Amino acid sequence: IDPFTPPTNAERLHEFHRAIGATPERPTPPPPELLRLRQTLLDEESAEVRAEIDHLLARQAAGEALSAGDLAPLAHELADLLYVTYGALDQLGIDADAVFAEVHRANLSKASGPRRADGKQLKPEGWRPADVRGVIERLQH
Amino acid sequence: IDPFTPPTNAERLHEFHRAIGATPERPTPPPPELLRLRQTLLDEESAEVRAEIDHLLARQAAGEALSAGDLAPLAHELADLLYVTYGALDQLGIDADAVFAEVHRANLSKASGPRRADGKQLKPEGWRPADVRGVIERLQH
Ligand SMILES: [Cl-]
Ligand SMILES: [Cl-]
Ligand SMILES: [Cl-]
Ligand SMILES: [Cl-]
Ligand SMILES: [Cl-]
Ligand SMILES: [Cl-]
Ligand SMILES: [Cl-]
Ligand SMILES: [Cl-]
């Protein structure tokens, strides 16, 4: 499935990494041990988000109408996930906003296509996929 | 483990959801079926990120010095993950930037603590944890 089925937050992660001694201004591969760690951490944070969804689903199944406050733990974990995802991009010395803008361009464009009779989102004429490599090359040079 | 071990992107997701017919201005619980979907999608996108890390790790292990371009698929998947994470928060009608700011405050503050002899990050005096519930209540009211 897929989605169709003042400083920015990226800049905040740069501030954070400065604080913990952790980053490059241009795209730069990290040490293996650091990739490994990032992989684990993404793994863990996505697991916590999915667990909080499970709790809400169980409460809804029992018939509860959740309040705004009830959504806080999930919102907290989601933000934690943004943090470590932005963290990865910052660690890589990749401008997250530049890459995000290109991904957003392509997704928004795809959203403007027609739908199949069964409701599946189709691409519009002349749809242009996200060219993230082009963004990276641009940032590097 | 943990991290110690112009429109914003959140606003872009609101634009996207408008485009696909998908959102609330105040925190609002979603339908169960939609939570279920979001859970699956987070699951899948985090799996793809972790797979791209595996590929880079294998290349590094073989002795390669990765170029900036080599990082594009990982950067692309990371941005895809931001997209569906921001997507969740938007779906919930929760201002992602407000929640992120509070999580960032707490993380940056924790970073200012001393480290144990073994290098573990300790909290500073009077450290105040992220109060995401307070943010949610504020957004609701
Ligand atoms: Cl509900
Ligand atoms: Cl409440
Ligand atoms: Cl991080
Ligand atoms: Cl198509
Ligand atoms: Cl490398
Ligand atoms: Cl290259
Ligand atoms: Cl989404
Ligand atoms: Cl501590």
Query: Which long-range contacts does A51-58 make (Cβ < 8 Å, 24+ apart)?
Result: A52/A77, A53/B35, A53/B36, A53/B38, A53/B39, A54/B39, A56/B29, A56/B35, A57/B32, A57/B35, A57/B36, A57/B39
Task: Give contacts of A 14-53 with B, CB under 8 A.
Answer: 15-16, 19-20, 26-29, 32, 35-44, 46, 49-50, 53
| Residue numbers in B near A72 (CB within 8 A) | 132-133, 135-136
Q: H/E/C letters for each residue in chain B?
A: CCCCCCCCHHHHHHHHHHHHCCCCCCCCCCCHHHHHHHHHHHHHHHHHHHHHHHHHHHHHHCCCCCCCHHHHHHHHHHHHHHHHHHHHHHHCCCCHHHHHHHHHHHHHHHHCCCECCCCCECCCCCCCCCCHHHHHHHHHC
Which of A16, A107, A136 faces B71 most closely, judged by CB atoms?
A136
What residue type is B140 in one-letter code? Q
Q: What are phi and psi of B32, to 5 degrees?
A: -45, -45
B45 labeled part of a ligand binding site: yes
Is A30:B121 a contact under the CB 8 Å cutoff?
Answer: no
Cα B22 to chain centroid, rounded: 20
Compute the distance from residue B76 Cα to the ligand 8 centre, in Å.
35
Superfamily classification of domain B1-141: putative ntp pyrophosphohydrolase like domain (1.10.3420.10)
Compute the distance from residue A16 Cα to the ligand 8 centre, in Å.
17
Distance between CA atoms of B71 and B89, rounded to whole angstroms?
27
Is B88:B38 a contact under the CB 8 Å cutoff?
Answer: yes
B87 CB-near residues (< 8 Å, 6+ apart): A3, B13, B16, B17, B38
Is A127:A109 a contact under the CB 8 Å cutoff?
Answer: yes
What secondary structure letter does DSSP report for A26?
Answer: S
Kindly state the tokens that stand for A97: 């906003």
Distance between CA atoms of B106 and B111, rounded to whole angstroms?
9
Our CA angle for B51, B87, B131, nearest 5°, is: 100
Q: How many residues does chain A have?
A: 141
Q: Which of A3, A6, A7, A14 shows the shortest CA–CA distance to A89? A: A14
Is A10:A82 a contact under the CB 8 Å cutoff?
Answer: no
Distance between CA atoms of A124 and B18, rounded to whole angstroms?
17
What secondary structure letter does DSSP report for A21?
Answer: T
CA distances from A121 to A100, B19, B48, B90 (A): 21, 11, 21, 20
B122, exposed or middle or buried, with CB in 10 Å at 0-12, 13-18, 19+? exposed
Compute the distance from residue B52 Cα to the ligand 6 centre, in Å.
16
B107 labeled part of a ligand binding site: yes
Compute the distance from residue B40 Cα to the ligand 7 centre, in Å.
12
Residue B75, Cβ neighbours under 10 Å: how many?
Answer: 28
Q: Which of B2, B9, B110 to mutate to test the interface with A (most CBs of A within 10 A)?
A: B9
Q: Which of B47, B43, B53 shows the shortest CA–CA distance to B74? A: B53
Please report the resolution in angstroms.
Answer: 1.9
Q: What is the DSSP string of A103-138?
A: HHHHHHHHHTS-B-TT--B-PPTT-----HHHHHHH
Elucidation technique: X-ray
b/e for A52-81, b at 16 or more Cβ within 10 A? bbeebeeebeeeeeeebebbbbbbbbbbbb
Characterise B115 by phi-psi region: left (phi > 0), alpha (psi -120 to 50), beta (else): beta
Q: Which of A94, A128, A71, A85 shows the shortest CA–CA distance to A25? A: A94
Characterise B25 by phi-psi region: left (phi > 0), alpha (psi -120 to 50), beta (else): alpha
Domain ranges of chain B: 1-141
The answer to whether A4 faces chain B, any CB pair under 8 Å, is yes
Kindly state the tokens that stand for B23: 């959102």
Residue B10, Cβ neighbours under 10 Å: how many?
Answer: 23
Residue A122, Cβ neighbours under 10 Å: how many?
Answer: 11
CA dihedral A123, A128, A24, A75 (to 10 degrees): -20
Min Cα distance A126 → chain B (Å) is 18
A65 CB-near residues (< 8 Å, 6+ apart): B29
The answer to whether A109 faces chain B, any CB pair under 8 Å, is no
Kindly state the tokens that stand for A15: 């501030």
Q: What is the DSSP string of A51-95?
A: HHHHHHHHHHHTT----TGGGHHHHHHHHHHHHHHHHHHHHTT--
What secondary structure letter does DSSP report for A28?
Answer: -
